[PDB]
Each structure stands twice: as C-alpha cells, then as structure tokens.
C-alpha cells in the first residue's frame, strides 16, 4: 500500500 502514497 505504501507505493500508492
């Protein structure tokens, strides 16, 4: 999920 932020 970190990649979308």
């Amino acid at each position: 999920d970190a990649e979308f932020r």
Partner: antibody
Amino acid sequence: EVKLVESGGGLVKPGASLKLSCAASGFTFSNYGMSWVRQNSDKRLEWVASIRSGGGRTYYSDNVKGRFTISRENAKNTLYLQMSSLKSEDTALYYCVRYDSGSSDYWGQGTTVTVSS
Amino acid sequence: YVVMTQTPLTLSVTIGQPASISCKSSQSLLDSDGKTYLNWLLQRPGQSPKRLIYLVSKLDSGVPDRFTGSGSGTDFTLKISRIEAEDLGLYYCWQGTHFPRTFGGGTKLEIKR
C-alpha cells in the same frame, strides 16, 4: 456495490504466458489504484503488483519483477496482469484488490493459476 | 522488507468469550505523515477477504463494535470482546507503511463447541 471479477486463470506450462483480467464495477475505476495479491495453498498472502490510478506508475515484488506486467484500460474498467516466464512457484489464487483510508479495501473473488506440464 | 509476525497460529474460542490476536512487525509502522498503516482482514470460508480495520483502530463500515484494534509502533492487537459464530475464519494483519506491503501469516479462528 463495489465488484471486482477476475478471469483468465487456468493451466499454463512452465515458461509460458498467461494474461489475467479483472472487471471492476460499482465505482469510478480511474480514480483508484489497483493491485494483484496472490494466496498460496498454505494460505499465505503475497503482494504481486500495483498500479496507480492514472496507470502511469507500476510496482512489482522482487518475485515477479521483469516477468509480469500490470496494466489497466480505464475506458473499459479493466485491470490486467500479463504473466510471462511462469514458474511452478507462481501457482496460486490471484486476487484483484482495490486501493483506497490509506489501504486496500475491496478484494475480488480470485482466479486460479496453475503452472504445470 | 517488513516482517509481520502474527500469533497465535490457531485460536479456539467459545461463543460469548473474548478472542485476541497479536501482530508484530520488524520495524515501526509509524509513517512520517504521522499515521500508522496497520490493517486487519478477515477471510471467511468460501469468501473473499474483507477488511475489518484500517489505521490500527478504525472499523470498516458495518463491522460490529465488538471488534477493536489497538497498538502502536511494532506491537498491535485485534480484540474480539464477545465472539459470535460468524467470526470464524482466517484473520490477517498487513502493513501499508513500507514498501513492499507485507502480510502476517494469518490466524485461523475456530469456534469451540
């Protein structure tokens, strides 16, 4: 209702290619990041690939990088996972997963990929 | 690579009794934006995973209040105060703070009768 419906799974030989698709409905597809996550026989969950809403940026785990290509066609509300050079370790249930609240929220029903001779 | 260590592996609990699942990460899940991206998910038999909890303690819409997530840094807990039969299945924590996203190995909750 948010709905994610995967298809295109099935039997594929080691080294060969298979393309999965996921049809999204119930939300504005182009506003959401999307990801593929796989689940193995031991029920381990493993992130595979992610793509941002505009399709400009793609992310891959070290396991599939250089082998898989995630993409999306927004006008068709469809997410794709092009798999190539498949390995027996790639055998699993593949889920289409929506990214929101800072996290993944909706999961599809999953499509089964079996890499076998 | 952030290792998510989830315990116990299996849990057997009587209806009406509390259940508690632990999730520990190999690094802090506090992001620099001040938020903590720790999530919990439930996969019931014959069903696709469904999110219960995000940002450590925030309940997904329609999740009953008997579910409560807590913790900070590297130590997190999911507590169910009063177990119902519908709660059975596989629970996973997973983190969205560092790349790549990583999942706990899951905890199978069984109803004891």
